[PDB]
Amino acid sequence: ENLWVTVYYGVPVWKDAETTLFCASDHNVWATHCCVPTDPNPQEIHLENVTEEFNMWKNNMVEQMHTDIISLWDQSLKPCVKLTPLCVTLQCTNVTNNITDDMRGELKNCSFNMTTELRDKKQKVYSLFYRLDVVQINKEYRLINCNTSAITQACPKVSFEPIPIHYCAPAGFAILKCKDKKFNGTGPCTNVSTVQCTHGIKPVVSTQLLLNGSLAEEEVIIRSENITNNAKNILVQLNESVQINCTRPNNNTRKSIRIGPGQWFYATGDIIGDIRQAHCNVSKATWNETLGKVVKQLRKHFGNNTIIRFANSSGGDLEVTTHSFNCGGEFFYCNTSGLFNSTWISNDSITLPCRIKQIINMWQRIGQAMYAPPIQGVIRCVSNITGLILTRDTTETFRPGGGDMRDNWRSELYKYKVVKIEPLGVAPTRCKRR
Amino acid sequence: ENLWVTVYYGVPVWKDAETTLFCASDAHNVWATHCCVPTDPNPQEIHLENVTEEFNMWKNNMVEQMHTDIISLWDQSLKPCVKLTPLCVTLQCTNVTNNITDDMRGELKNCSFNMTTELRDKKQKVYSLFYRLDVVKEYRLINCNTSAITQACPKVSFEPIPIHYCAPAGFAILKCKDKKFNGTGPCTNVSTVQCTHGIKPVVSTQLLLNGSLAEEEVIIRSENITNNAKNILVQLNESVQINCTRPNNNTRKSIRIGPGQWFYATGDIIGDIRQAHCNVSKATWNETLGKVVKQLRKHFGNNTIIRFANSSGGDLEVTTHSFNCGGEFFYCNTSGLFNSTWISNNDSITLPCRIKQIINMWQRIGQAMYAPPIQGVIRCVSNITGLILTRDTETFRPGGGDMRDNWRSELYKYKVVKIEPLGVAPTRCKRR
Amino acid sequence: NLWVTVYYGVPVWKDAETTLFCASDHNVWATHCCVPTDPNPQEIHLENVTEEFNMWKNNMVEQMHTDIISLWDQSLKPCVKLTPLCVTLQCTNVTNNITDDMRGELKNCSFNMTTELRDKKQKVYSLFYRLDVVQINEKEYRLINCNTSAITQACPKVSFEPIPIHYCAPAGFAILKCKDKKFNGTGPCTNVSTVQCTHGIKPVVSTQLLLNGSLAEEEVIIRSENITNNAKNILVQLNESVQINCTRPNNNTRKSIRIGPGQWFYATGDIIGDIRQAHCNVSKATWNETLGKVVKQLRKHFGNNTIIRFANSSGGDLEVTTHSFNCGGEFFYCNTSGLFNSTWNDSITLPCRIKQIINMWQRIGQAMYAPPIQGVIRCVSNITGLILTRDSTTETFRPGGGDMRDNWRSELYKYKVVKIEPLGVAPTRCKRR
Amino acid sequence: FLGAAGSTMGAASMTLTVQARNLLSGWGIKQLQARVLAVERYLRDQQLLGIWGCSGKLICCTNVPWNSTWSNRNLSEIWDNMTWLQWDKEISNYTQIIYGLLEESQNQQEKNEQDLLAL
Amino acid sequence: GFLGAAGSTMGAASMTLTVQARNLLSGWGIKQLQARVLAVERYLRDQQLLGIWGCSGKLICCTNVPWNSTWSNRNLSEIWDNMTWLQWDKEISNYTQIIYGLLEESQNQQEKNEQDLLALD
Amino acid sequence: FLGAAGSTMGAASMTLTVQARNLLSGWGIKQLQARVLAVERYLRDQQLLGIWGCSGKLICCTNVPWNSTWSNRNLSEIWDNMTWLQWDKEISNYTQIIYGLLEESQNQQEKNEQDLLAL
């Protein structure tokens, strides 16, 4: 009867939105990239009496994190030496040395003729290679990727060590965070707070096992888009970490070869001391308890009258059939088949042998290749297993999987949503102009 | 007399201006990865009731803007492609005599050469076919003694699609709707639009293909028709249909150059080897020229003779008609369309064509593109919507020239103006 | 009693560092400095302003340095990389019309190189200066900077002649200028004006002596960060110019060599007529009076009874040991020891050497090849200052520098960039409503 | 900052300056695009408030009557039992109508002011 | 519609100020970004100027600067009707800066006068 | 432009239009950054004046009293005998405190206007 339109500005409302996020932090590629410092104060604002709907599989923050890592990774390799001049026939024989375990035949001693600083001359050089880097054509060999792409040597001073990255909203935007300790992955969430920046997320790249992520507050949280449709990956988050001790035991050196006028190649040099197999150690008791925790929670979706079995998985690609792990400066491909072979019906340790690969084709791309410079000395890493990526095949059987990469970030970004602030609006009041 | 200054904001006035326009499109094409902004169906036009705007197509900066953007786009799309530097070796060539239906006599050649392969320590012997226009028994390619030849990526299409130019904020585009607008001077039926009608970026020579038609009669336009050194653009009232083909069933041979580097060579030809040609309706063409003649006489006098004849600048950019038919480069002989004397007092026309693969485009000579071969048989059917004519009784000939003249045939009705919303006028009030 | 009142448009500022832009009026600084400026001088005088200025740790200097390096490098991007020519050379010591002073200076070098087709070769020859040719470690020679880096040929149509450059503030910023004459690079300055753009500064590249630029208003001005610290340079600005004229008296020819796909290398061709060494002429009387003025104002920091003596350079590469007079496309390395031998007919000549493969800005991963100029070069320029270093009862001064920032501090010392902060608060006898 | 969200409409209006301030304050082309957009969004809202005669205010009262069509709820049951998110959803289909009406009203008001000043 | 009133008389077009104003602020890609920045700068220069003159927030601002017959010696009947804004803009183009300067001076004086009136309480 | 910078504040207060009118009017990434920042700084000041209720004015009086804490100098020695640069040096730490008070005052005033207009 006597109500009039009053216009208000600064109204605390929003809409779901897709915008551009920027990073912040605290010769690393991400330290160079994330030039914006974070505020030591999280500035987290609790929102009382709200029920926000979240969906981790529809979250565009995932696409940006993926896009940003690909872009950064590639940009950092642009101003580097190409190894196109190394795509020549190699003459390779097996390394004869004090070689133990089953490493005999794993390494080869390759000699070849490459370019020099002088256009009129070639030089005879040699280097060591792992079997996984070299393809036989006969003692005649080629590097594996010379038939599809140029191989770029990564710049030796560039560090790809993951450091925490914080994603921050631009002005006019905000990030809502779900604090429900039991959050499903989809649906309404109570105890939602607003933040400016996310917690730091380390851009760790791996398959099968997820290393150095966040832990669940209680039990195991099992999240998948459908569960029923076994084609989807299951992301399993643990409330306890499992420590894994990894090493490359050989004492390596480098042989620096000049290949042109301001360009050089780092060859794997002679091995100092005996040759041993690379491997990872997982405490057995901890691992068996961890699976028991996962299986108990997994049963909630299948029944408490069933059987849960694990498989060693399968595939046509080392990136997914083995545990892809980046330790220090070298890429490991570890055998987890003895880690996932139990069947669950209701001091000791397991050693996982690991293979080392030097020519890397990341992000499942074909047209690009990177040569990982060899690392001097002996390599040791200790990592935290914080979660697993599993797939499913009357007994149910589960196996290690992943490799899409996006799934390695969904596990950290599932609690965040980006919204757009819409500060202008109207409502009826008793107040009239003039 | 107590009159005071009042300030108004939102005043509907403007100034002539130049600015940056952006592209939009409807719905692997080189322009589809550019014109990422959708257009508005029913874009809305606003008629201005009492505006007599002065337009000038030959001073229109939009032509320059369209031209520079096309050149830029063209070059940018060829950057991430395979260079053919490794093919600048000598060739050993013989003629193809394999069921040639006469009149080639070496136009198509069978060549072989020493080129690179997967490893740097190896070489390979390869075979390919070439067209005579691309080749200098010892032969070289025509563009290996200067610049470099880059192979166009087989994955990018250069098919023209409609391009709409749209004004940025603060600007508007005025469209001239007057009947028989001749390119310059005042225009009465002026309307404001946000974007152009959609122009296909066709790159033909001599004849203007797939453009807009005149609605009442043929329109003759030139900057100064009496100068005898300007191109005359002719906008036709009706289209003339032309059927163009390359009848030979070809093949594509894939040759490795290096590490992910591939060359697409012309392979063997299946079936008889025949000449490319275009079929122009004769009756339509005879009527079409008669209409042009009637209109040209309005500028030259009722007692003159137009006299059609062919051009002489034989660099194949001026004397022949370029199409980009199927992405192929035809270079057709149009002299048979222009030899007649008009005095005031099916029987189709067949034009032979000359296929060429190494193209120095946009009259530049510091760059060259190699057009990958197209397998199968090519046919295009298109609409002749206009002509480029020149003159020197006085004789008319097909012209040719810089691309700005083709694009100016569609942008001739549009002008860009800057909106100036702030202004002042007297009024009977005071601030207090 | 007093209420807060807020004002906007308040004439105050803060020290600040921001990005300045280039303003002007086929040069390398053309097309990259497209804002015409100074149609009318500004110079707004600020009465009763005593601002603090500092030549050292200035921001304008760092940007000028940074921008020049960037521009310089950008200009070479589209030109020939001289991928070939690291082949070895077969060189002959040229004696034809050469005097004893230049024996071994020029070499006639022949070599194999590629051509238009990949599997074809050609034999060419050209002349080189001794400075750019090193005997191979294995009559066989190589170019110096060929074994460690690519040499980009300088673009034949790009002029690197310095033109005046004006630096201009972005909106919201202003440049304050110190008009004092006794300022000496630091401290509070009385008579400060505000400008939008600096005076034009010519980006002249040099070492030891400062060439074309401004003169001191009254007397010789000696500026140093710490006059007592022998690790610092002394920039001396003269109040009088000294003319120097340099020449390369050799009627050169150019030999164009085709590389690969129509790329061209411009080789030094033969020499028409007599072959003679490059040199520079400096007026003797002017130079001796100039030093007299420099020492008179220098003794003020050491004592009226101390002895000042001059000496030549201590060591290092030509970039620091010799004068680096830069002519329109040529790099001269001139011997200045003859200018610095005193203790405190009518001309002195300085011998000069010519180098073509240039490593600029003290960098070693890049090199540029300066193509030859035909005919004879004659350069006339003004000496405006010196870069000196110091190292009892007697002090020794020597030519120094080489840090390009020193050649820019000498023009930018009077300017400071400030940020305008128009909002502020004060009390008043005025309350709202 | 959305700290008042979830509180009722009559409570939330107490913080309008908090939300307003934080709207503006907060390869590299990526950041310029983000910054330019933030500015454009800010200005669009300021232009609307200005064109409706609400320049400089966070709360402005107009002369456009409330239509029971848009909402037939009482004053109570809007301001005390609802938050802004709920309100925004209930009348989200009328926003463009209200905005058009507000612009028409301001134009009429300014014309009347000019004619009054004329006396 | 936008510019629909362009051919109408000055006193008719006054009813479409809203329409023109609401469309000014926006209703290789580097050039798109440059265009967006400039559109904002143009918009802001006009808004700043209205602020300086004390016309902020209004489409129609009545000031206290008298009209000079020198700028244009015409009656209201010769301006508000029988004339479009385009014609007017040309007619007084050469006095634009004079008027703008006068408007600035007036507003500055008005602000000082108001501060003094508030003080006298 | 800044001609009054060395002058008495009581004189300098009359050149406010001169400084304000020169704030907007006077390598692609660097130029865009320069332009975007100039705009951003301008808008930050305009938003802030709006929040405090001083939009559209170069000179405004508010309802926040002056505290002796910020300055115990008398009035004559503030407006005379001192420049704005000197005044700025005196009021440095007591800046954000004023801004907070100005915001609080304006919020109370807008609520009061809305309630008064409902009678």
Ligand SMILES: *[C@@H]1O[C@H](CO)[C@@H](O[C@@H]2O[C@H](CO)[C@@H](O[C@@H]3O[C@H](CO)[C@@H](O)[C@H](O)[C@@H]3O)[C@H](O)[C@H]2NC(C)=O)[C@H](O)[C@H]1NC(C)=O
């Ligand atoms: C999970 O987090 C742990 C702990 O941050 C990661 O292991 C650590 O990796 C760094 C970098 O490789 C090692 O630092 C090294 O220090 C020596 C000097 O002590 C230096 O010479 C090397 O160049 C390097 O900077 C660090 O020692 C190592 N920590 C442990 C306990 O071994 C681990 O890699 C992360 N997991 C994954 C999958 O990335």
Ligand SMILES: *[C@@H]1O[C@H](CO)[C@@H](O[C@@H]2O[C@H](CO)[C@@H](O[C@@H]3O[C@H](CO)[C@@H](O)[C@H](O)[C@@H]3O)[C@H](O)[C@H]2NC(C)=O)[C@H](O)[C@H]1NC(C)=O
């Ligand atoms: C004038 O416009 C006509 C169309 O109205 C243009 O001809 C058309 O060109 C396209 C592309 O070359 C042809 O489509 C192709 O068809 C094959 C077989 O179906 C397919 O494999 C290709 O991927 C592609 O879709 C289209 O059929 C053809 N239309 C006609 C009637 O022949 C003509 O080229 C334009 N004029 C000029 C000068 O460009």
Ligand SMILES: *[C@@H]1O[C@H](CO)[C@@H](O[C@@H]2O[C@H](CO)[C@@H](O[C@@H]3O[C@H](CO)[C@@H](O)[C@H](O)[C@@H]3O)[C@H](O)[C@H]2NC(C)=O)[C@H](O)[C@H]1NC(C)=O
């Ligand atoms: C200091 O300033 C003087 C005076 O501006 C500079 O002298 C000028 O130097 C340029 C480049 O060497 C000379 O340009 C050439 O002139 C000939 C004339 O025939 C022309 O054919 C060439 O194409 C080129 O344009 C210019 O003539 C000369 N000016 C005079 C009066 O001699 C001097 O180079 C500056 N010194 C330094 C170190 O920058």
Ligand SMILES: *[C@@H]1O[C@H](CO)[C@@H](O[C@@H]2O[C@H](CO)[C@@H](O)[C@H](O)[C@H]2NC(C)=O)[C@H](O)[C@H]1NC(C)=O
């Ligand atoms: C374009 O000009 C015509 C006249 O040439 C305008 O027509 C007048 O419209 C008003 C509308 O209220 C009538 O009262 C007049 O009687 C009409 N005059 C004549 C001679 O018919 C027309 O309105 C103008 N266009 C615009 C947009 O204003």
Ligand SMILES: *[C@@H]1O[C@H](CO)[C@@H](O)[C@H](O)[C@H]1NC(C)=O
């Ligand atoms: C993890 O969850 C289990 C659930 O039974 C609980 O017993 C255990 O204490 C939890 N561990 C930690 C570290 O909180």
Ligand SMILES: *[C@@H]1O[C@H](CO)[C@@H](O)[C@H](O)[C@H]1NC(C)=O
């Ligand atoms: C890793 O090595 C440390 C060495 O002190 C040891 O304490 C820890 O238990 C080991 N972890 C595993 C999983 O074996």
Ligand SMILES: *[C@@H]1O[C@H](CO)[C@@H](O)[C@H](O)[C@H]1NC(C)=O
């Ligand atoms: C191809 O035919 C032409 C016909 O004029 C002849 O001149 C040429 O020599 C022939 N080519 C070869 C390799 O025989």
Ligand SMILES: *[C@@H]1O[C@H](CO)[C@@H](O)[C@H](O)[C@H]1NC(C)=O
């Ligand atoms: C030409 O065609 C005939 C059939 O008409 C066929 O027998 C002959 O082999 C063909 N010749 C060539 C060179 O293909």
Ligand SMILES: *[C@@H]1O[C@H](CO)[C@@H](O)[C@H](O)[C@H]1NC(C)=O
């Ligand atoms: C390869 O080079 C040799 C050099 O004698 C030549 O005889 C042979 O014909 C070449 N191969 C090809 C395909 O031209």
Ligand SMILES: *[C@@H]1O[C@H](CO)[C@@H](O)[C@H](O)[C@H]1NC(C)=O
């Ligand atoms: C403008 O449109 C009207 C529509 O009736 C038409 O009669 C008139 O001839 C047109 N004017 C011109 C110059 O084409």
Ligand SMILES: *[C@@H]1O[C@H](CO)[C@@H](O)[C@H](O)[C@H]1NC(C)=O
């Ligand atoms: C048009 O052509 C005539 C021919 O005599 C010439 O005199 C005139 O100058 C030309 N005008 C223009 C504008 O080119």
Ligand SMILES: *[C@@H]1O[C@H](CO)[C@@H](O)[C@H](O)[C@H]1NC(C)=O
């Ligand atoms: C035009 O050319 C044809 C042959 O293509 C010829 O028969 C005809 O007589 C020519 N006509 C004229 C006017 O030259």
Ligand SMILES: *[C@@H]1O[C@H](CO)[C@@H](O)[C@H](O)[C@H]1NC(C)=O
């Ligand atoms: C060059 O040749 C002359 C011949 O008389 C000789 O005296 C001189 O020492 C030679 N110089 C060099 C560097 O070989």
Ligand SMILES: *[C@@H]1O[C@H](CO)[C@@H](O)[C@H](O)[C@H]1NC(C)=O
């Ligand atoms: C070119 O190479 C041949 C290879 O036998 C060699 O004999 C000749 O001396 C070289 N020529 C030059 C100028 O280096």
Ligand SMILES: *[C@@H]1O[C@H](CO)[C@@H](O)[C@H](O)[C@H]1NC(C)=O
């Ligand atoms: C430079 O000027 C400052 C001003 O205080 C003075 O103290 C210093 O001694 C001067 N230095 C020289 C070398 O003249």
Ligand SMILES: *[C@@H]1O[C@H](CO)[C@@H](O)[C@H](O)[C@H]1NC(C)=O
């Ligand atoms: C060249 O330098 C000498 C130095 O003695 C001087 O006398 C002469 O005038 C100078 N020439 C020019 C053109 O300045």
